[PDB]
Amino acid sequence: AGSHSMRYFSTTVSRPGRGEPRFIVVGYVDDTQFVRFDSDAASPKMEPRAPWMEQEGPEYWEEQTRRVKDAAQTFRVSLGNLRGYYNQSEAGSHTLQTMSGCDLGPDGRLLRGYYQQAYDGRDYIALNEDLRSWTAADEAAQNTQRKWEAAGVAEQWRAYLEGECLESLRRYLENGKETLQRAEPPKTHVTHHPVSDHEATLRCWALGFYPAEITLTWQRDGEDQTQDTELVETRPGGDGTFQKWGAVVVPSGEEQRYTCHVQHEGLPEPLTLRWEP
């Protein structure tokens, strides 16, 4: 694809009286997971979660493990700091989430770099697109913004996001190319289920596609019935592919006035489908 992304998603959850916060981090290239770390594992280390990662040598894994353990210590400190900023009890569990990573554009340059955090599921602080400034979501986060502005944190992220982040992403794209660079088109079909003598559910299916981005819309007389359509969230197959469907309930005699339109990267041309009894 012309553009690609790499993301790390970390979750840190405190558990008062039950030891140190649990720390999980997962890495994705596009919609494909490639690594994990779980602080509650027997011997916690960064681990491959895609077969093409297995070729990285042991020093790669040691360095990634060092980095995630360092991050975990800082996030446990942050949890403490934020508990203070929000004047919260030591009795309750809280959650710190971070997202970081880079988008590679077709010119080979950084399309967008990210570093942002959420506290208890709400925006806390985010690196801005210029990678030189911060957005704080509230007054408490301004405490953090001031400290990070003084410590030159943004520049450190800028250097990573424009340098090693992209260098790593390029390497993963090469090592994993047979699967990461393959757009798998959806297998599609329409099913039909009477709900009465007079009406039926038309369900348009898209199966086995990669990446996850897809559009699935039911048409009648050439416009979209977004309001009369049950459209489920795109969901994983569990085999690295994704699935989705959209359904309408229609009068039996109007069934052939309905078409499902499907667009996806792996399709040469958009599909227009119908109930074909």
Binding site: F9, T11, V13, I24, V26, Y28, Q33, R36, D38, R49, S93, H94, T95, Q97, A118, D120, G121, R122, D123, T191, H193, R203, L207, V232, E233, R235, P236, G237, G238, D239, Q243, W245
Partner: protein, 100 residues
């Protein structure tokens, strides 16, 4: 803390055919906080050997997980997913519909 209720989808990996081995999936998403209980059920009973994906989250910070296990569907058996989360009044049970 902003809390969010889990969405639940129960489905098979491949189109279900009686007698053919397959995978039963329960995809939970859109929830916060991350603590959650998910069981796959065969005729009301908890199935063993259920695995799950590594905890991840979406753009709005809400979490998602896939729970899954091998199954071979047939006419006899009923399958479901039961989910419990702090946002729920009690566990939510969603039955497997072979057409959804």
């Amino acid at each position: 803390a902003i809390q969010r209720t889990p969405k639940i989808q129960v489905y098979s990996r491949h189109p279900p055919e009686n007698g053919k081995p397959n995978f039963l999936n329960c995809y939970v998403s859109g929830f916060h906080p991350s603590d959650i209980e998910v069981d796959l059920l065969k005729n009301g009973e908890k199935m063993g050997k259920v695995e799950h994906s590594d905890l991840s989250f979406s753009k709005d910070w809400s979490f998602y997980l896939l729970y899954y296990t091998e199954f071979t569907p047939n006419e006899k058996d009923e399958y479901a997913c039961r989910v419990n989360h702090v946002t729920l009044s009690g566990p939510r049970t969603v039955k497997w519909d072979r057409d959804m």
